[PDB]
Design a protein around this ligand. Structure first.
Ligand code: FMN
Ligand code: FMN
Lengths: 219, 219
């Protein structure tokens, strides 16, 4: 190991700037393809996330064809109407007004998966909670989401669809599970607070109400 | 919604630095207490994470007492004994020589939970994959891991336990699930590559092997 400590004031500020201004983007994606170099940078950041037992359970399928985007978007529509019919009155009306994906518009999409069987028979750290491998994959997603913002690339996670329909589109095996579908593209503008808060779907919870001391429920 | 774009060369480098140099720390934690302000910043960061339907399913149980850390440590050991047992001969010995937690060393520990029933009867984006709320919570963890790195603070995830045991020690309800136990403390030395690689457990996988173009298995 080598010497380490806190970043400089400017370095820490750049770190919190990405964490604080990254948004989940749906409708602001610009049409320019992301350079090959920029993509390698984004995947690299993801590849450096931590992973249980250093399993590195992830795979990334790059999707850049209209044909594929169309099939995925339709799978979204089928699922989204279904989700829509799970609400009523004004909350349903409000649900149908939200943009929940940017699939056909984002010049790039990425389906991040988790190979449940990588790492051999037994994987360190996943001996007691088997979901840790999936969680590892999410860490890879956030690292990319954060790297993306710094590059001025908007990223949007889309989870509205029946998994099996997507695995069919991409040919993903049974031992591999989809963790996320991500829409990517440059942006020249972002919301300053979560879009769902601005559109009145749900507001930011008071952090002070979610922190306990020693025991659950104890402030 | 306002104008936005890529970070400056220096800001981008800072974000990538945290991403590339952060590690899972187990045995280098320092006894020095973290200030309440430093803890607010780390928690603030996590709370800036994305969350399905803006669910914000997380809660953070700060642990700072010797007695709690002792009970939690015993839990770890039992779990870890039965885990080591799952490896044979050569590998088992290697497993046993690894340090997989700094529960007793870390001056601060944080149990990050996910309330499966928050957000109402139905929660946006979580109508097809009921796991999206846990995934959201992992995003919170990764933001805290990254901010912590910039603060010169180390973070170590420990998942080798029998969850039911930890829930009982912290008095966590049935509708709430533990996503992660994070050990925290200042750190002045960090491995230059994942500790498990340096110790011969698993090497870094070749990213080129995990990226596909358009469909699974296609280069
Ligand atoms: C696991 C997960 C799944 C998500 N799925 C969707 C989705 O399907 N459609 C969508 O518009 N947003 C989706 N989101 C984004 C949240 O709605 C978003 O985090 C929040 O409303 C805005 O957060 P932000 O302003 O930090 O981006 C998802 C987020 C997470 C963490
Ligand atoms: C979901 C998850 C659970 C983990 N659980 C443990 C654990 O129980 N004990 C441990 O020593 N490390 C644990 N780790 C850390 C990994 O072993 C470590 O991230 C990897 O070997 C190299 O990580 P780094 O690049 O962060 O150093 C966990 C990581 C993840 C993502």
């Amino acid at each position: 190991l080598t010497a380490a400590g806190a970043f400089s004031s400017d370095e820490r500020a750049a770190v919190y700037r990405a964490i604080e201004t990254r948004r989940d983007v749906r409708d602001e994606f610009l049409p320019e393809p992301l350079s090959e170099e920029l993509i390698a940078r984004l995947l690299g950041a993801a590849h450096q996330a931590p992973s249980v037992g250093f399993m590195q359970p992830w795979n990334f399928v790059l999707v850049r064809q209209d044909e594929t985007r169309e099939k995925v978007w339709q799978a979204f529509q089928r699922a989204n109407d279904e989700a829509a019919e799970m609400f009523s009155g004004e909350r349903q009306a409000k649900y149908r007004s939200l943009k929940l994906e940017g699939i056909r518009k984002a010049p790039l999409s990425i389906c991040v998966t988790c190979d449940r069987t990588r790492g051999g028979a037994v994987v360190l750290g996943r001996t007691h909670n088997p979901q840790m491998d999936l969680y590892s994959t999410v860490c890879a997603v956030q690292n990319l989401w954060l790297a993306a913002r710094a590059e001025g690339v908007g990223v949007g996670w889309v989870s509205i669809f029946h998994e099996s329909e997507i695995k069919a589109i991409l040919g993903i095996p049974d031992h591999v599970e989809i963790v996320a579908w991500l829409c990517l593209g440059f942006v020249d503008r972002l919301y300053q607070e979560p879009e769902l808060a601005a559109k009145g779907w749900r507001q930011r919870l008071p952090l002070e109400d979610l922190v306990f001391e020693e025991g659950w429920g104890v402030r």
